[PDB]
Amino acid sequence: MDETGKELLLVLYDYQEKSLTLKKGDILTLLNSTNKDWWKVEYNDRQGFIPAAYVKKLD
Numbered sequence: 001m002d003e004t005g006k007e008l009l010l011v012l013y014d015y016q017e018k019s020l021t022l023k024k025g026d027i028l029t030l031l032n033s034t035n036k037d038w039w040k041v042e043y044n045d046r047q048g049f050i051p052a053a054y055v056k057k058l059d
Contacts, residue, residue, distance in 0.1 A: 006030070009041060009055040020048035028055065 001008065007030040015022045022028070022043060031047060032040035039052050 001027070001029075003029075008058045009039075010058055011050075011055055013054050015050055015054050017048050017050070020046065020050065022050065022054075027058075030057070 009028040009030055011022045011024055011026040011028060014024050020041070020043065026043060028050075029042040030039060031042050033052070037052055038049050039055070040047060041050050041055070
């Protein structure tokens with residue numbers, strides 16, 4: 001959130017990574033949106049993948 005230029009994401013629905021555990025309301029940093037359906041994201045110094053459908057870009 002300090003890093004200028006980074007894109008923040010709002011988690012809309014609780015998500016438990018099958019293969020990250022995110023709660024509704026959590027704010028993530030977008031790391032990689034190369035794939036349209038699965039995005040690499042960052043939360044509290046950890047990284048993982050989440051379906052793009054679970055989040056909204058805050059822009």
